[PDB]
Amino acid sequence: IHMSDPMCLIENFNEQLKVNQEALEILSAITQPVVVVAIVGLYRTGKSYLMNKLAGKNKGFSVASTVQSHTKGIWIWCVPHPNWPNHTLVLLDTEGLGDVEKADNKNDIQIFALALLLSSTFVYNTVNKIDQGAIDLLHNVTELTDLLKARNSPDPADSASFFPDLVWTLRDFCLGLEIDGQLVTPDEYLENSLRPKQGSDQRVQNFNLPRLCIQKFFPKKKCFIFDLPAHQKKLAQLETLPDDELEPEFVQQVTEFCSYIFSHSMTKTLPGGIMVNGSRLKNLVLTYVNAISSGDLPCIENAVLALAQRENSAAVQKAIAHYDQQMGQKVQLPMETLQELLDLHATSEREAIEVFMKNSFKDVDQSFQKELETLLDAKQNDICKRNLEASSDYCSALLKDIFGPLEEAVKQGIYSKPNLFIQKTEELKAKYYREPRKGIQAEEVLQKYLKSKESVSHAILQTDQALTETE
Amino acid sequence: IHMSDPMCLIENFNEQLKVNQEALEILSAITQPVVVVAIVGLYRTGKSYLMNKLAGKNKGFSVASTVQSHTKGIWIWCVPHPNWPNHTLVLLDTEGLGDVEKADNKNDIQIFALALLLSSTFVYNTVNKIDQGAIDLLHNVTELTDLLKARNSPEDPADSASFFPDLVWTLRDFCLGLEIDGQLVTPDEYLENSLRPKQGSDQRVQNFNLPRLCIQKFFPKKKCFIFDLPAHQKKLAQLETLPDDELEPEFVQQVTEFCSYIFSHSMTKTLPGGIMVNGSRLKNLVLTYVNAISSGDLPCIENAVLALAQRENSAAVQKAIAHYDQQMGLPMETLQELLDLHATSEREAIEVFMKNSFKDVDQSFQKELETLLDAKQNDICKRNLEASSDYCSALLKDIFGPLEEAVKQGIYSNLFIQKTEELKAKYYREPRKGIQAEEVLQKYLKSKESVSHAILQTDQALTET
Numbered sequence: 001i002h003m004s005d006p007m008c009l010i011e012n013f014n015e016q017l018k019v020n021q022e023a024l025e026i027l028s029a030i031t032q033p034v035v036v037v038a039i040v041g042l043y044r045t046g047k048s049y050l051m052n053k054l055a056g057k058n059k060g061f062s063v064a065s066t067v068q069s070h071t072k073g074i075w076i077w078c079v080p081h082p083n084w085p086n087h088t089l090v091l092l093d094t095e096g097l098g099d100v101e102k103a104d105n106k107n108d109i110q111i112f113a114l115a116l117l118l119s120s121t122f123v124y125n126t127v128n129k130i131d132q133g134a135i136d137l138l139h140n141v142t143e144l145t146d147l148l149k150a151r152n153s154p155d156p157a158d159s160a161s162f163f164p165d166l167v168w169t170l171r172d173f174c175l176g177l178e179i180d181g182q183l184v185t186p187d188e189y190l191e192n193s194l195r196p197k198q199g200s201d202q203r204v205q206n207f208n209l210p211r212l213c214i215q216k217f218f219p220k221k222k223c224f225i226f227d228l229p230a231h232q233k234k235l236a237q238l239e240t241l242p243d244d245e246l247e248p249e250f251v252q253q254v255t256e257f258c259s260y261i262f263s264h265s266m267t268k269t270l271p272g273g274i275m276v277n278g279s280r281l282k283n284l285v286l287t288y289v290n291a292i293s294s295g296d297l298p299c300i301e302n303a304v305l306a307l308a309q310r311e312n313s314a315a316v317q318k319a320i321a322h323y324d325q326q327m328g329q330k331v332q333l334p335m336e337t338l339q340e341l342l343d344l345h346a347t348s349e350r351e352a353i354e355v356f357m358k359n360s361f362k363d364v365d366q367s368f369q370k371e372l373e374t375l376l377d378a379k380q381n382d383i384c385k386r387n388l389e390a391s392s393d394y395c396s397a398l399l400k401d402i403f404g405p406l407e408e409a410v411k412q413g414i415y416s417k418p419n420l421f422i423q424k425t426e427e428l429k430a431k432y433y434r435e436p437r438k439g440i441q442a443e444e445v446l447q448k449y450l451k452s453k454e455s456v457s458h459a460i461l462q463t464d465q466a467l468t469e470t471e
Numbered sequence: 472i473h474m475s476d477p478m479c480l481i482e483n484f485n486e487q488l489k490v491n492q493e494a495l496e497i498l499s500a501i502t503q504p505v506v507v508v509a510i511v512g513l514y515r516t517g518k519s520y521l522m523n524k525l526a527g528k529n530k531g532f533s534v535a536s537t538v539q540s541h542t543k544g545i546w547i548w549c550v551p552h553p554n555w556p557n558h559t560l561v562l563l564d565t566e567g568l569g570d571v572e573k574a575d576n577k578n579d580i581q582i583f584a585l586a587l588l589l590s591s592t593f594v595y596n597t598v599n600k601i602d603q604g605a606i607d608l609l610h611n612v613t614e615l616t617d618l619l620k621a622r623n624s625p626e627d628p629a630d631s632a633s634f635f636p637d638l639v640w641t642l643r644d645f646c647l648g649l650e651i652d653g654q655l656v657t658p659d660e661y662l663e664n665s666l667r668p669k670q671g672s673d674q675r676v677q678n679f680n681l682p683r684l685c686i687q688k689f690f691p692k693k694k695c696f697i698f699d700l701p702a703h704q705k706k707l708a709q710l711e712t713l714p715d716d717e718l719e720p721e722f723v724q725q726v727t728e729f730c731s732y733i734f735s736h737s738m739t740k741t742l743p744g745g746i747m748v749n750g751s752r753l754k755n756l757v758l759t760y761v762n763a764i765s766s767g768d769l770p771c772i773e774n775a776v777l778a779l780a781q782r783e784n785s786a787a788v789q790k791a792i793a794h795y796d797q798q799m800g801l802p803m804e805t806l807q808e809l810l811d812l813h814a815t816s817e818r819e820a821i822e823v824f825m826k827n828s829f830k831d832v833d834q835s836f837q838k839e840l841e842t843l844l845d846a847k848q849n850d851i852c853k854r855n856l857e858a859s860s861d862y863c864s865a866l867l868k869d870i871f872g873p874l875e876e877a878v879k880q881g882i883y884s885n886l887f888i889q890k891t892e893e894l895k896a897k898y899y900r901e902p903r904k905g906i907q908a909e910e911v912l913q914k915y916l917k918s919k920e921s922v923s924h925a926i927l928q929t930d931q932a933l934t935e936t
């Protein structure tokens with residue numbers, strides 16, 4: 001019915017997640033509702049030892065005392081609940097985080113996430129003190145867990161209502177529980193560490209981001225302290241010593257921790273008022289392991305690579321900002337020649353690339369440099385086409401200020417007398433040609449106008465011939 | 472000549488790093504070469520206590536025993552070198568990392584980086600065991616420190632790593648068996664085993680080898696020391712007041728062995744060009760790097776959730792632009808459909824973005840896309856125009872071209888107006904033209920407003936004779 005000894009539930013075979021069918025079969029045979037308690041923390045912090053206490057046994061989850069990690073994967077121990085009749089207590093012992101020999105550092109987050117998803121009570125095991133790194137890791141994995149859970153979902157309860165209750169344990173605790181001159185309980189110490197700072201300013205955003213998350217996903221928190229259990233020369237073989245050879249405060253602290261778990265941990269639930277049993281827990285194991293194996297848990301690349309990308313992206317923005325202010329050398333969009341525009345773009349592009357290199361950091365494959373290159377190319381066509389229509393629009397304005405009076409004169413009839421229209425057009429064409437600061441479009445605008453008015457010239461000549469005969 | 476007591480060298484004023492001028496002047500007055508030893512680690516790990524041991528004193532850098540952080544900023548203690556005549560030993564005690572009350576989490580990286588840049592021996596203080604998080608933190612800050620050094624440097628130059636301090640990794644409250652794969656190891660062999668890059672060059676190894684290849688490069692000379700729990704757990708709060716026979720005897724011996732190694736192997740701090748650092752040059756380094764940090768030269772390690780938010784939101788905007796670019800399937804008959812199709816396209820890109828977005832704070836990636844799509848709308852709104860003009864102008868050259876030739880011949884030397892009106896209706900009947908239809912025609916009729924009168928003049932003259 002229940003398990004005399006724990007078994008491995010989830011293995012890391014090679015570097016894939018593998019479920020143990022023997023443990024699944026035993027688990028799915030559990031017909032009672034299950035209270036699931038999981039422990040997670042850095043490796044070599046006495047997690048397996050503490051979990052054996054919850055089972056009320058002296059041995060169980062394997063314990064070791066070298067610098068090397070010991071527990072691998074996630075282990076399962078289904079035992080009768082010692083206090084709640086007709087309930088099964090489900091204990092989950094986990095591979096510790098931060099193993100400096102483990103190549104698959106991302107598997108840490110997978111085990112962390114699985115512990116949050118499978119448990120109803122989550123025991124976060126830390127040493128000496130609350131560290132910001134422990135807070136940020138809980139923050140990061142909680143967000144990744146909620147995202148994965150949303151990618152595997154189909155009324156009013158939010159996803160956060162199904163996260164487990166948080167139990168924060170402090171091992172080898174020695175520092176004074178005193179904050180700003182006031183003595184505090186372990187719970188008040190936890191609250192002070194997790195309390196968002198008041199206000200809305202930028203000075204507070206980063207501090208409050210993980211705490212707003214933990215406040216949201218873990219409303220019910222509990223903190224426990226544990227003294228050093230014995231002299232350090234006796235920590236190896238600790239599980240061999242009877243309670244009267246350990247520190248009395250530690251023995252009582254372990255008892256108070258176990259009593260809280262037995263009295264406050266709840267049956268795991270699922271959306272729709274469903275009480276989880278062994279079979280439904282097996283479905284949760286298979287569901288989430290497959291979701292992780294198919295990529296539903298996001299993966300963040302190493303922080304040095306992410307920071308390099310942020311700095312290179314900033315470097316490209318400073319590069320185009322320096323090429324945009326350097327185009328003040330162009331004192332005129334109607335430039336005289338087109339090659340002077342191209343040369344000024346080249347010197348500005350060349351200067352902007354230097355400021356990019358100055359502000360860049362490990363731009364692998366020049367991927368961010370090539371991006372800047374295609375941006376500056378777009379800046380070339382953008383200035384070459386705005387140059388064209390700056391020449392046209394200015395030249396067209398001169399055609400209506402030099403030739404405007406002649407158009408009115410011809411419309412009146414001044415040149416209906418008995419070829420002196422052509423003579424004055426040529427002198428006004430040279431007038432137009434002498435106007436400084438006309439772009440490269442000058443000849444085109446003028447010739448297009450002369451062809452527009454080449455049909456009026458013929459008619460004026462015709463009329464001149466007709467009137468010559470009359471007298 | 473030297474300091475009887477330590478002073479604060481760099482303060483945390485509000486949340487900016489500010490240098491204490493009094494300490495700078497005392498430092499710059501030190502004329503002897505300096506051996507600079509700095510300690511860095513998570514807070515409440517006995518850093519200040521251990522530094523007082525290097526000073527050979529029972530008090531010095533302030534020590535406290537509550538859960539709250541104690542040391543703030545960076546403190547400096549210039550003392551005579553205990554073995555080398557005419558040398559000054561410079562001790563740097565640092566604010567601990569990971570303070571859960573500290574809003575300016577980025578100031579951790581600044582203090583770490585300054586400790587690396589100002590020291591010749593770097594003491595990395597950790598508890599119980601070598602942690603992967605401690606390795607990654609050293610990796611990140613070392614890379615950021617080299618970047619800060621590179622942005623403030625302007626001949627056959629020495630490597631940058633050759634000026635980084637020697638690494639001393641201390642393990643406090645050490646209890647685990649120094650045994651790896653059945654073989655007993657020394658503390659140094661334990662450190663090297665933790666930092667040894669894995670062989671293979673495959674992808675399964677890249678992440679593991681990234682921090683270790685870095686630390687191998689910048690810290691070739693490494694040393695590891697273990698320290699037992701120093702005393703009974705009820706007496707740790709008063710450690711610096713207790714005599715040696717109330718501490719663990721192995722701890723007293725371990726502290727002495729640590730101090731002796733530091734004194735015997737630490738080198739005078741050097742700079743490029745065979746320059747030996749003294750008090751004045753150390754002051755110049757302090758001012759150089761503190762100002763560089765205040766001007767933004769030191770990158771900041773962001774929260775992992777924000778890095779994921781930007782990576783996924785950046786993917787979401789690209790997924791948004793993929794569907795608004797695919798919505799183009801230009802000689803359309805109507806102009807308001809241009810606005811209508813842009814509205815359906817802009818609304819479609821916003822909808823696909825939200826589907827793939829994650830923690831878009833301030834709507835910064837949405838608002839950017841909103842103003843981004845407007846530039847795509849206006850770009851197509853006027854590009855339709857110039858496709859209509861160029862087409863409509865082309866029809867004026869095939870419908871009015873023959874009439875223009877007729878006027879040059881003399882066919883209309885008034886029934887010219889009659890055929891212009893019939894060709895104007897011809898042009899108006901030409902299917903498939905945009906808003907420029909009226910534009911080319913009116914500009915053309917204004918171009919051709921002077922020919923009508925001249926032929927009229929000729930017709931009058933011809934009627935006479």
Ligand SMILES: Nc1nc2c(ncn2[C@@H]2O[C@H](COP(=O)(O)OP(=O)(O)O)[C@@H](O)[C@H]2O)c(=O)[nH]1
Nearest residue numbers: 044045046047048049063064065171235236238
């Ligand atoms: N300092 C300390 N050591 C402990 C404590 N509990 C157990 N240990 C010892 O720490 C070593 C590692 O314990 P273990 O259960 O394997 O840690 P785990 O890797 O987190 O599961 C064992 O030798 C234990 O005897 C504790 O509260 N404090």
Ligand SMILES: Nc1nc2c(ncn2[C@@H]2O[C@H](COP(=O)(O)OP(=O)(O)O)[C@@H](O)[C@H]2O)c(=O)[nH]1
Nearest residue numbers: 515516517518519520534535536643707708710
């Ligand atoms: N467990 C332990 N405590 C220590 C050790 N060294 C000093 N302490 C105590 O730890 C507390 C914090 O020391 P402190 O120097 O202020 O740590 P810091 O914040 O890193 O500078 C003090 O009460 C010390 O008495 C050690 O090696 N192990």
Ligand SMILES: [Mg+2]
Nearest residue numbers: 048062070071
């Ligand atoms: Mg274990």
Ligand SMILES: [Mg+2]
Nearest residue numbers: 519533541542
């Ligand atoms: Mg201190």
